[PDB]
């Protein structure tokens, strides 16, 4: 009836436009109940320490520790040299260097050749 | 210049003979007095250096570095006494002894007239740093950090030693004045290329050069606060000082041996600035900042112009002060919350306003707000690079955009937003911490008032 | 629909406690127990700074060459010079397109 | 200070565009049960307001009178 | 431009502070009579912004438009300048019409 | 200065004022404890409209999860007072 | 914000939320009050036209079509209340909110001013300390063996009890703290 | 100056604010009228724009299509 | 505009090019032409420091206006005769430029038509 909205990576699909939430099953209801139970258990565990009058300091969060560890220390032990890894490493670690080397070498060779011929307009060029 | 060396050697037994509850007071007072004495080295000439004796001399390049070292010792002492309160008296005295020995080695390194004596002292600085890191670091990674700190250095410096002795068999001297006056060009041969690499790689790994920098995040994150202060502020500048000394014998080979290092420095400056944008640990962000600024310094030294040398000197001094201040600022929060994760403690401006002002000023100097000496050095280097090639303004320009971003990012993450609800142990700032921040920041602006003192011999 | 009796009761109890807490935030009449000419603005904010600036410019800045450079005054026909006394002639007998 | 709400029974949709809305809805079998809640936006000192041109020429009359008297003085001031 | 732009922003701020920090023009009704001085100032500022003759904005904007007309210039730039100087009056009209004319649309506690 | 310090009596007065201007509710039959569905015989859509009228009256929004539960003028007054830190 | 959410929304809840959203966006389109009232009555008639559909599948299909139409015809710049999550004053006063525990760190000279306030604070702290263990015990009793299944908390039931986990709700900073 | 809320009525107005607003609108209009009466050329233009077609070839110096 | 429409849509051959103008000798159609005189000396304009763009053939009126403005400083409404005279001189200058443009257009069109007609006569 109306023009259709299509989602993208940086502009996602709205919940009210999602087909999965319009055709539901008792299995889906059970899964939602389990999700809410997990969230409620975590919320109770946090709130018990949050309201503790004898608690002074920082309530340690295992999820934050897991996130930082995964982002920092768990990366190399889970690395394998593969065609994708090797190709991406070679590209993004070597290509820019040679690209910039070619650019700068060409520019400086042109400038040097111009200077040898004596046509660069270096008047008032005292500081370098 | 024994009038500076002997008082530090006297700091040693003064610390070891002090009463158990007066070590910090005595060490701080006499360290400040030694800094005041070393202030007299800033009276430099326009033609040559201050040649004190056959062994020691002072230039317009090494005098600000000596002043920075002697000024950094009392700040390190002030920053260390908080987390060392539970320590035994003997171990506290040993820690202070390590700091004093490091200062002595640095002072003698910056003024040695011969290159082998310079090499010996510049390697001798390794032992106290490694001991401090591996004995008084907090986490288990410190051990690995120590190893990364050691071998990365030595794998660079062992070839240099060989080259040095080889040079002394060829020219008959390693005295820097003789080396400068009797300079001869380097021809284009494979032997000369490898001599150039042997003379350059140790200082390159000290800066550090991008690709050879992996030791630095580990060592500067795992170290105690004084270790991080002295690693960022002074020990990184050994590479730059040594490179500016050693380049007098490498011409005209440098004219084309600098290309890989220039490309590495510029692209890796962009890369480390980008890395700072996605960092979960606050100390690692400051370490990668140091890497970017040192890449700028490497470019300045490699292009070999008077403007680039002046910019390099100014940038080294400014970065030393700024990075030490940033490490201390991060350490205050770490001591409060016992975690280095940046997003753990937020909205700290609401709880600690004056510390938030210190954070703002430190981050403003990091992004080189004019007319700070950070900006003066950065602008001189950028102008020299523009003369070297007009296209460099692209990469340098990109760097200027990224730096500010991550700098402000850091501030916005820690000071703004809302405070974390469950963190209830954030006590008001102590007088010691505020005094530490002030003693970092005031010399920066005072130096802005008179910039020719940090612009070097050029 | 609506609250369950448990939710309603918890809301009433929390509301009573919250209203007590908000009432307790009020200040008693003594709470801030503190422990123990006309044209002077134009003198300390205009006259003194202008004295200092005028002294600094008259006796220090202008003691060196090319520190205060003014563009020369405009000269028009029929003017007389203050220093030399020279007069400038008129302008070439206008055609008078009246 | 110490002011009370007006009587709620004076709010009527009579003589307002809400009357027109009600008459148009009644032609469709519908009803609007919220018009009296909006009647105050048309009832009292908000009953009438100027147009765009009328707003633009706000103080035109006094300005024109001053201009006329000034020009009249000027015309018979050159008779000196 | 400094004068009347600062005045227009100050009039907007006066409206915002009067209506309990509300910034949407769809909830500002008839303020022509309720806020007389602010109405007068905003009307004068809008007339100056549109280059109405002999006001402050006239002596710069009118000359700018005439200079753009009489120069050897890109024709598309001239056309966009004319369209923009029409749209200026258009959005000034939008502000005045929605904020000051008509019936109130703000909450009943005045 | 700013707006006066809203009180519970003022909140209740305004809530009742809004409710007596609703054509589907008899003014005399309305009290502060009257249930919208049981006592007054309104459905869910009328309750949504009542919540929206309250939002327009007091210049702030009530989330749907909280707005679903309010069923008498007293609950509305209590919710508004709790939101705005009114204790007198 | 105050009520504990459920595991899912029901069909009636979704219909009512769509009705409120549609009316708000229509008001955003219809700036004037009389026009908004007219089109809101039309929208209400359109909503209650299909109120008595006994086939649930057809009801959800109608809801789906209505949500698609809403997304097509939504106002790109709808009116937001200034303190609502999209408003111009949403989190304006969060920088002025200071947690109460900071008062424990005031210097005694600062506490010398306001003696009565700090006496009342001590009374409140004593009450919290005396109530905590009973709150914990009540939560232990009332919780099912497989952990809690919702985020709803019970009220106080005993003689002089307090509702469990009340301190951080009762001692909220304020809506306009400074 | 104390002005209290009104609750669904027109707000209270002081005489001074209306006087000021009316005076300033009147002075703007007087300035417009006066400046137009004295400086009309600033709007309508001062000098006649000529039509080039009415220039004879004698003053423009073009020969009579022969040479 | 009409000249723009004539040039861009019509025959651009007979339309003057503003950048390349004039293409005909200044004494082509005229028997003799007076040399456009200048009233202000270079030294007078230099002393008045007018501008490099205001040093046109109307510079004497501008100099008079500037002198009158400097002499009648507080009364900033006293330099009306001088400003009017300078405006009149600039208007005459613009009229002369318009006359040059129309002369160029007429010369171009007449010359092209005459050459084409002579060639057409030679073609029979
Ligand atoms: C330019 C004006 C000149 C004024 C003349 C006199 C100035 C004397 C200043 C002396 C040095 C400042 C001391 C530094 C430490 C900060 C103090 C502190 O800790 O706060 C406690 C103190 C107690 O107040 P509080 O009630 O407790 O509130 C504290 C709260 O935490 C919250 O406190 P807050 O919210 O009020 O914020 C504290 C404040 C303080 O934080 C700061 O940012 C101050 C530090 C400066 C920034 C450092 C990085 C920038 C690099 C530039 C280096 C310039 C140095 C020049 C030489 C200096 C000589 C030592 O920050 C700000 O207010 C905003 C900062 C934005 C500054 C933007 C300007 C950039 C440069 C513009 C011109 C600079 C060159 C001038 C000449 C140019 C050519 C004519 O705070 C204050 O009293 C206010 C500070 C005053 C602000 C100074 C900003 C302008 C001065 C810039 C350099 C001075 C140049 C003088 C030469 C003459 C010109
Ligand atoms: C992770 C970062 C680590 C730090 C980075 C250090 C950077 C070191 C890079 C060295 C820069 C240049 C070294 C030598 C200069 C020229 C090299 C050569 O490629 O150039 C040509 C050399 O020609 C050919 O290329 C021969 C060399 C080929 C063999 C070299 C092996 C390079 C392959 C890459 C291996 C990776 C090395 C680094 C390991 C980590 C020039 O032609 P030619 O004029 O005749 O030689 C000049 C010398 N002459 C005059 C005495 C004759
Ligand atoms: C800005 C413009 C965009 C907006 C466009 C929107 C277009 C949508 C208009 C049409 C949408 C519909 O009617 S969708 C029609 C949906 N019909 C049904 O679901 C029938 C079953 N009835 C019920 O569920 C309840 O009676 C209930 C209706 C919830 C009442 O709740 P209460 O009685 O318990 O209060
Ligand atoms: N190398 C420079 C250092 C310097 C810079 C600035 C000065 O003002 C003085 C000296 C010499 O010359």
CA F38 to centroid of ligand 3, rounded, Å: 22
- b/e string for B47-69 if b means 16 or more Cβ within 10 A? eebbeeeeebbbbbbbbbbbbbb
Are the beta carbons of B160 and B201 closer than 8 angstroms? yes
**Chains touching chain B at 3 or more Cβ pairs under 8 angstroms?**
A, G
Contacts of D15 (CB under 8 A, 6+ apart): none
Question: Can you list the positions of beta strands (E) in C15-97?
Answer: none
Cis, peptide link before residue B371, omega less than 30° from 0: yes
Q: Which residue of F has its CA nearest to C5?
A: F69
- CA separation for the pair D4, D14 (Å, rounded): 25
Chain E 37-66, CB below 8 Å of chain F: which residues? none
**Sign of the torsion formed by the C-alpha atoms of B173, B175, B178 and B184:** positive
- The contacts of residue B188 (CB under 8 Å, 6+ apart) are B253
H7 and chain E in contact, CB less than 8 A: yes
Using a CB–CB cutoff of 8 Å, tell me whether D38 touches chain G.
Answer: yes
From residue F65, how far is each of C77, F27, F55, G14, I14 by CA, in Å? 87, 28, 15, 11, 79
Contact B292, B273 (CB under 8 A): yes
Question: Among all chains, which residue has been given the structure tokens 């007087």?
Answer: H30
Separation CA A66–CA A74 (nearest Å): 10
- CA separation for the pair G134, C93 (Å, rounded): 112
Q: Which tokens go with I63? A: 């100099």
Pair B154, B119: CB distance under 8 Å: no
Rounded Cα distance between H7 and E108, Å, is 5
Alpha helices in B281-367 (DSSP H): 282-303, 306-337, 348-351, 353-366
Indicate the helix (H) or strand (E) that contains B92.
helix B89-111
B30 Cβ contact list (under 8 Å, min separation 6): B7, B10, B11, B14
- Report whether B336 contacts B280 (CB < 8 A): no
Beta partners for residue G108, in sequence order: none
Farthest CA pair distance, chain E: 59
Looking from the CA of B123 toward its CB, the CA atoms found within 13 Å total 16
Query: Which amino acid residue places its CA nearest to atom 11 of ligand 4?
Result: B458
Chain F residues with CB under 8 Å of D34 CB are 21-23, 49, 53
Question: Does ligand 1 have an atom closer than 6 angstroms to the CB of B371?
Answer: yes
What angle, 0 to 180 degrees and rounded to 10, lies between the N-to-C axes of helices F44-58 and F8-20?
130
With an 8 Å Cβ cutoff, is G42 touching chain C? Answer: no
CB of B457 shorter than 6 A to ligand 4: yes
Distance CA D69, CA D80 (A): 18
Q: If you measure from the C-alpha of residue E40 to the centroid of ligand 4, how many angstroms do you get, rounded to a whole number?
A: 61
Burial class (CB in 10 A: 0-12, 13-18, 19+), B408: middle
Question: Residue B444 Cα, ligand 1 centroid: separation in angstroms?
Answer: 13
Give how far Cα B433 sits from Cα of B320, C45, D13, Å. 19, 36, 70
Distance in angstroms (rounded) separating the CA atoms of residues B224 and B87:
14
D18 with G34: Cβ contact below 8 A:
yes
| I100, burial (CB in 10 Å: exposed 0-12, middle 13-18, buried 19+) | middle
State how far the Cα of B426 lies from the Cα of G105, in Å rounded to an integer: 9
Ligand 2 centre to CA of B193 (Å) is 9
Per DSSP, helices labelled H in B347-426 are 348-351, 353-366, 373-388, 392-414
Ligand 4 pocket member B311 (CB < 6 A)? no
Check if D31 contacts G (Cβ < 8 Å): yes
Residue A12 Ramachandran class (φ > 0 left, ψ -120 to 50 alpha, else beta): beta
Q: What is the DSSP string of G55-85?
A: -HHHHHHHHHHHHHHHHHH--SS----TTST
Q: What is the b/e burial string over G2-18, where b = at least 16 CB atoms within 10 angstroms of the residue's CB?
A: ebeeebbeeeeebbbbb
* Structure's resolution in angstroms: 2.5
In chain I, residues with a C-beta closer than 8 Å to the C-beta of C74 are 47-49, 66, 70
Could you tell me if C78 and I67 are in contact, meaning their C-beta atoms sit under 8 angstroms apart?
Answer: yes
Cis amide prior to B208 (ω within 30 degrees)? yes
For residue A91, the tally of other CB atoms under 10 A from its CB is 10
Q: Does G6 touch chain D (CB under 8 A)?
A: no
Residues 6+ apart with CB under 8 A from A79: A85
Q: What are the φ/ψ torsions at residue I107 (nearest 5 degrees)? A: -65, -45
Q: Look at residue E68 and give its three-state secondary structure.
A: helix
Cα A62 to Cα G3: distance, rounded to the nearest angstrom: 27
Nearest to G2 among F45, F61, F66 (CB): F66
Instruction: Using alpha carbons, select from B98, B122, B22, B107 the residue that is nearest to residue B71.
Output: B107
Is I102 in contact with H63 (Cβ distance < 8 A)?
no
Q: Which of B116, B127, B114, B118 is nearest to B154 (CA)?
A: B127
Within 10 A of B161 (CB to CB), how many other CB atoms are there?
A: 17
Cβ atoms within 10 A of the Cβ of E87, count?
A: 10
CA E47 to chain centre: 7
Residue G11 — φ and ψ, nearest 5°?
-65, -45
**Cβ contacts of C25 on chain G, cutoff 8 Å:** 117
B74: enclosing H helix or E strand: helix B62-80
> Who contacts H58 (Cβ-Cβ below 8 Å, separation ≥6)?
none
Residues B49, F80: Cα–Cα separation, whole Å: 79
Contacts of D49 in chain E (CB under 8 A): 30, 32-33, 101-103
Q: Residues F43, F56, F66, F82: which is the catalytic one?
A: F43
Tell me phi and psi for residue G146, to 5 degrees.
Answer: -90, 30
Q: Pick from B38, B1, B46: which is nearest to B456 by CA?
A: B46
Give the residue among E5, E15, E7, E9 at the shortest CA–CA distance from E60: E5
Residue B133 token pair: 């890191």
Residue whose entry in the numeric block shows the structure tokens 């284009």: B188
CA distance B339 to A58: 9
- Provide the β-strand partners of residue B114: B175
Q: Please tell me the distance in Å from E35's CA to the nearest CA on chain H.
A: 9
- Bridge partners, residue B50, by sequence: B58
Q: What ligand is nearest to the CA atom of residue B449?
A: 1
Residue with tokens 């104390």: H2
Closest CA to A55 of C14, F16, G165: G165
List the beta bridge partners of residue C87. Answer: C80
Q: Which residues contact B440 (CB under 8 A, 6 or more apart)?
A: B75, B321, B324, B325, B328, B362
| Closest by Cα among B235, B254, B98, B246 to B163 | B246
- Bridge partners (DSSP) of residue B341 are B281
Tokens of G26: 């229509």
Q: In angstroms, rounded to a whole number, what is the distance separating the alpha carbons of residues H44 and E80?
A: 24
Q: In residues, how long is chain B?
A: 458
* CA–CA separation, E71 and B294 (whole Å): 53
C-beta neighbour count of B153 within 10 angstroms = 24
In the 8-state DSSP scheme, what is residue B234? I
Helices (H), chain G: 11-29, 33-49, 56-73, 108-112, 115-142, 167-170
Joined together, the tokens standing for residue B146 give 């120590």
Q: Can you list the positions of beta strands (E) in A23-100?
A: none
Give CA–CA dist B25/B184, Å, rounded. Answer: 52
Cα–Cα dist I62/I58, whole Å: 7
CB proximity list for D73: less than 8 A, separation 6 or greater: none
Q: Taking a C-beta distance cutoff of 8 angstroms, is the pair B177, B51 a contact?
A: yes
Q: What is the DSSP letter of H49?
A: P
E98 and G31 Cβ atoms separated by less than 8 Å: yes
Burial D44-65 (b: 16+ CB within 10 A, else e): eebeebbeeeebbebbbebbbe
Q: Name the token pair of B193.
A: 């290329």
Ligand 1 centre to CA of B309 (Å) is: 30
Cβ pair B309, B300 in contact under 8 A? yes
d(CA B194, CA D38): 90
| Nearest Cβ partner for G175 among F44, F79, F85 | F85
The Cα–Cα gap between G153 and D9 comes to 44
Beta-carbon contacts of I108 under 8 Å, excluding residues fewer than 6 positions away, are: I13, I14, I15, I16, I23
Angle between helix B89-111 and B62-80 (nearest 10): 170
Both structure tokens of A64: 């934050």
Structure tokens at C64: 């060196």
SS3 content of chain I, % helix, strand, coil (to 5): 60, 0, 40
Cβ(B8)–Cβ(B70) below 8 Å: no
Intra-chain end-to-end CA distance of chain I, in Å: 40
Q: Kindly report each contact of residues B120-129 with a partner whose C-beta sits within 8 Å and lies 24 or more positions away, as own/partner.
A: B122/B157, B122/B238, B122/B242, B123/B154, B123/B157, B125/B235, B125/B238, B126/B150, B126/B153, B126/B154, B128/B98, B128/B99, B128/B101, B128/B102, B129/B102, B129/B227, B129/B230, B129/B231, B129/B235
CA angle in degrees (0–180, nearest 5) for B188-A128-A100: 60
For residue B93 the two structure tokens come to 């005295």
Domain over F8-84 is classified CATH 1.10.1200.10: yes
Gap from E32 CA to chain H (nearest CA, Å): 11
DSSP assigned state of G4: P
Give the dihedral sign, CA G17/G20/G24/G30.
positive
CB count within 10 Å of CB C77 equals 19
- Residue B175 pairs in a beta bridge with B114
Chain D to chain F, count of Cβ pairs less than 8 Å apart?
A: 27
- Give the integer Cα–Cα distance in Å for G139 and A49: 13
- Tokens in use for C15? 């509301």
Mutate to test the interface with I, among C86, C90, C92, C97 (most CBs of I within 10 A): C92
Instruction: Give me the torsion for CA of E106, E108, E109, F2, rounded to 10°.
Output: -10
Q: What is the DSSP string of B117-144?
A: HHHHHHHHTHHHHHHHHHHH-SSTHHHH
Angle at I40 between CA I37 and CA I42, to 5 degrees: 105
**Sign of the alpha-carbon torsion through C61, C63, C66, C69:** positive
Rg, Å, chain H Cα set: 30
Rounded Cα distance between B162 and B171, Å, is 15
Q: Is I123 exposed, middle or buried (0-12, 13-18, 19+ CB in 10 A)?
A: exposed
Task: Determine the residue of chain D that is closest to F46 in CA distance.
Answer: D33
Cβ-contact D41, E103 below 8 angstroms: yes
Of G32, G33, G79, the CB nearest to E24: G79
Residue G53, phi-psi category: left (phi > 0), alpha (psi -120 to 50), beta (remainder): beta
Instruction: State the Cα–Cα distance between residues B108 and B125, nearest whole angstrom.
Output: 10
**What are phi and psi for residue B114, nearest 5 degrees?**
-105, 150
Distance from CA of E46 to the nearest CA of G (A): 23
Element (H or E) spanning F54, and its range?
A: helix F44-58
Task: Report in angstroms the alpha-carbon separations of G10 from F70, G21, G50.
Answer: 18, 17, 17
* D30 in Cβ contact with G45 (< 8 Å): yes
Chain H, 8 to 67: residues with Cβ < 8 Å from chain E are 8-11, 13, 17-18, 20-22, 24-25, 28, 31-32, 35-36, 39, 42-43
In whole angstroms, what separates CA G72 from the centre of its chain?
29
For residue G168, the distance in angstroms to the closest alpha carbon of chain A comes to 7
**Of the candidates E54, H11, B322, the residue with the CA atom closest to the CA atom of residue B330:** B322
The answer to whether the CB atoms of F68 and G16 lie below 8 A apart is: yes
Which residues of chain H are within 8 Å of residue I107 when distances are taken between CB atoms?
62
C56-95 residues touching I, CB cutoff 8 A: 72, 74-79, 88, 91-92, 94-95
With CA atoms as reference, report the closest residue to I65 among I88, I43, I46. I88
Write out the two tokens for A33. Answer: 């109940």
Active site residue F43: yes
User: Does ligand 4 come within 6 angstroms of the Cβ of B305?
Assistant: no
Q: Closest CB to F44: pick one of G12, G81, G175.
A: G12
Q: Tell me, in angstroms, the distance from the centre of ligand 4 to residue B307's CA.
A: 10
Q: Report the candidate in C14, A51, C10, B427 with the shortest Cα–Cα distance to residue G129.
A: A51
Backbone φ and ψ for C80, nearest 5 degrees, come out as -120, 135
Residues I27 and G172: their CA atoms lie apart, in Å, by: 95
């Amino acid at each position: 009836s109306f023009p259709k909205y299509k989602p993208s990576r940086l502009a996602t699909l709205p919940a009210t436009l999602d087909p999965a939430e319009y055709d539901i099953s008792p299995e889906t209801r059970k899964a939602q109940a389990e999700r809410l139970a997990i969230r409620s258990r975590l919320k109770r565990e946090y709130l018990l320490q949050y309201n503790d009058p004898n608690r002074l300091g920082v309530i340690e969060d295992p999820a934050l520790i897991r996130w930082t560890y995964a982002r920092s220390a768990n990366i190399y032990p889970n690395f394998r040299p593969t065609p994708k890894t090797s190709l991406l490493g070679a590209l993004f670690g070597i290509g820019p260097l040679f690209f910039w080397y070619y650019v700068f070498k060409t520019d400086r060779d042109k400038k040097e050749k111009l200077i040898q011929e004596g046509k660069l307009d270096q008047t008032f060029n005292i500081s370098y | 210049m024994l009038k500076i060396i002997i008082p530090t050697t006297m700091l040693l037994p003064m610390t070891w003979m002090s009463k158990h509850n007066m070590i910090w007071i005595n060490a701080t007072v006499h360290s400040l007095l030694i800094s005041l004495i070393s202030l007299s080295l800033l009276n430099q000439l326009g033609e040559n250096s201050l040649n004190f004796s056959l062994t020691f001399f002072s230039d317009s390049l090494s005098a600000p570095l000596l002043v920075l070292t002697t000024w950094l010792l009392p700040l390190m002492l002030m920053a260390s006494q908080s987390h060392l309160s539970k320590e035994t008296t003997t171990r506290k005295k040993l820690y202070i002894t390590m700091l004093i020995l490091l200062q002595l080695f640095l002072i003698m390194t910056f003024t040695a007239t011969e290159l082998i004596l310079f090499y010996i002292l510049f390697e001798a600085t390794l032992v106290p740093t490694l001991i401090i890191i591996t004995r008084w670091g907090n986490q288990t990674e410190r051990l690995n950090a120590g190893l990364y700190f050691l071998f990365y250095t030595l794998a660079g410096s062992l070839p240099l030693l060989v080259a040095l002795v080889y040079i002394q068999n060829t020219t008959g001297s390693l005295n820097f004045l003789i080396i400068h006056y009797w300079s001869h060009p380097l021809s284009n041969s494979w032997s000369n290329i490898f001599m150039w690499l042997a003379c350059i790689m140790a200082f390159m790994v000290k800066m550090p050069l991008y690709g050879l920098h992996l030791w630095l995040p580990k060592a500067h994150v795992e170290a105690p606060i004084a270790g991080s202060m002295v690693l960022a502020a002074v020990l990184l500048k050994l590479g730059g000082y040594g490179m500016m000394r050693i380049t007098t014998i490498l011409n005209p080979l440098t004219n084309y041996m600098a290309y890989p290092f220039l490309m590495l420095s510029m692209w890796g400056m962009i890369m480390t600035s980008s890395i700072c944008l996605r960092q979960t640990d606050l100390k690692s962000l400051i370490a990668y900042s140091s890497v970017s600024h040192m890449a700028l310094v490497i470019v300045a030294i490699m292009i070999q112009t008077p403007w680039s040398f002046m910019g390099a000197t100014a940038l080294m001094i400014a970065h030393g002060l700024t990075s030490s201040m940033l490490f201390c600022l991060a350490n205050t929060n770490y001591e409060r919350v016992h975690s280095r994760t940046m997003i753990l403690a937020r909205g700290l401006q609401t709880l600690l306003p004056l510390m938030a002002t210190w954070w703002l000023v430190a981050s403003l100097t990091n992004l080189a707000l004019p007319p700070s000496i950070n900006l003066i050095g950065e602008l001189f280097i950028i102008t020299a690079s523009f003369s070297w090639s007009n296209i460099t303004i692209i990469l340098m320009g990109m760097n200027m955009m990224i730096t500010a971003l991550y700098s402000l990012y850091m501030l916005i993450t820690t000071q703004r937003g809302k405070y974390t609800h469950h963190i209830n142990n954030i006590k008001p700032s102590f007088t010691r911490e505020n005094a530490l921040m002030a003693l970092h920041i005031l010399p920066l602006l005072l130096l802005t008032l008179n910039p020719k003192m940090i612009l070097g011999p050029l | 629909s609506g609250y369950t009796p448990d939710e309603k009761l918890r809301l009433q109890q929390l509301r009573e406690l919250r209203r007590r807490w908000l009432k307790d935030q009020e200040l008693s009449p003594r709470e801030p127990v503190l422990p123990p000419r006309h044209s002077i603005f134009a003198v300390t904010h205009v006259l003194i700074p202008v004295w200092i600036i005028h002294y600094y410019l008259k006796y220090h800045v202008t003691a060196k060459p090319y520190t205060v450079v003014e563009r020369k005054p405009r000269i028009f026909p029929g003017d007389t010079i203050l220093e030399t006394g020279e007069v400038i002639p008129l302008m070439k007998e206008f055609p008078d397109q009246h | 200070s110490k002011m009370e709400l007006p009587d709620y029974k004076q709010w009527k949709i009579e003589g307002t565009p809400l009357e027109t809305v009600q008459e148009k809805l009644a032609a469709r079998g519908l009803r609007d049960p919220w018009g009296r809640n909006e009647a105050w936006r048309y009832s009292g000192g908000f009953a009438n307001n100027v147009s765009f041109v009328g707003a633009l020429l706000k103080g035109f009359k006094w300005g024109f009178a001053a201009f006329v008297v000034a020009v009249g003085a000027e015309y018979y001031l050159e008779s000196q | 431009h400094a004068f009347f732009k600062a005045m227009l922003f100050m009039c907007s701020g006066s409206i915002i502070h009067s209506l309990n920090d509300e910034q949407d023009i769809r909830k500002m009704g008839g303020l022509y009579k309720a806020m007389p001085f602010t109405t007068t100032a905003l009307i004068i500022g809008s007339l100056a912004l549109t280059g109405m003759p002999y006001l402050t904005g006239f002596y710069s904007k009118d000359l700018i438009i005439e200079a753009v007309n009489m120069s050897y210039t890109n024709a598309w730039a001239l056309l966009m300048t004319l369209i923009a100087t029409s749209l200026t009056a258009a959005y000034s009209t939008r502000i005045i019409f929605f904020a000051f004319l008509g019936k109130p649309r703000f909450p009943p506690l005045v | 200065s700013d707006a006066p310090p809203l009180t519970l009596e003022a909140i209740k007065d305004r809530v009742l004022y809004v409710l007596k201007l609703y054509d589907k509710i008899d003014p005399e039959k309305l009290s502060v404890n009257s249930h919208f569905m049981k006592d007054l015989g309104l459905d869910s859509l009328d309750q949504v409209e009542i919540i929206m009228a309250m939002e327009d009256e007091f210049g702030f929004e009530i989330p749907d999860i909280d707005a679903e539960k309010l069923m008498c003028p007293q609950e509305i007054v209590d919710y508004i007072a709790d939101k705005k830190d009114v204790y007198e | 914000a105050f009520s504990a959410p459920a595991a899912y929304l029901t069909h009636q809840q979704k219909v009512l939320r769509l009705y409120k959203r549609a009316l708000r966006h229509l008001e955003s389109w219809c700036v004037h009050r009389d026009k908004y009232r007219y089109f809101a009555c039309l929208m209400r008639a359109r909503f209650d036209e299909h109120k008595n559909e006994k086939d649930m599948v057809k009801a959800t299909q109608l809801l789906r079509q209505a949500e698609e139409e809403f997304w097509y015809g939504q106002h790109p710049q709808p009116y937001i209340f200034p303190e609502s999550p999209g408003g111009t004053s949403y989190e304006r006063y969060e920088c002025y909110k200071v947690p109460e525990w900071c008062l424990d760190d005031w210097h005694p000279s600062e506490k010398a001013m306001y003696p009565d306030y700090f006496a009342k604070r001590e009374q409140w702290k004593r009450l919290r300390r005396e109530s905590w263990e009973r709150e914990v015990k009540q939560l232990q009793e009332e919780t099912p063996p497989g952990g809690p299944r919702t985020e709803a908390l019970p009220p106080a039931r005993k003689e002089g009890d307090l509702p469990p986990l009340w301190w951080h709700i009762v001692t909220r900073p304020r809506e306009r703290p400074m | 100056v104390h002005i209290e809320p009104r609750y669904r009525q027109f707000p209270q107005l002081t005489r001074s604010q209306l006087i000021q607003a009316e005076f300033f609108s009147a002075t703007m209009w007087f300035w417009i009228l006066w400046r137009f009466w004295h400086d009309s050329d600033a709007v309508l233009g001062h000098f006649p724009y000529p039509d080039p077609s009415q220039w004879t070839d004698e003053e423009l110096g073009i020969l009579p299509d022969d040479e | 505009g009409a000249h723009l429409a004539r040039r861009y849509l019509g025959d651009a051959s007979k339309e003057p090019d503003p950048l390349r103008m004039p293409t005909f000798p200044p004494d082509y159609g005229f028997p003799e032409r007076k040399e456009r005189e200048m009233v202000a000396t270079q030294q007078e304009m230099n002393d008045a420091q007018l501008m490099l763009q205001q040093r046109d053939y109307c510079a004497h009126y501008l100099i008079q206006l500037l002198k009158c403005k400097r002499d009648s400083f507080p009364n900033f409404l006293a330099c009306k005769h001088e400003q009017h005279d300078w405006d009149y001189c600039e208007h005459l200058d613009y009229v002369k430029r318009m006359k040059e443009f129309e002369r160029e257009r007429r010369l171009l069109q007449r010359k092209k038509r005459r050459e084409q007609r002579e060639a057409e006569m030679a073609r029979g």
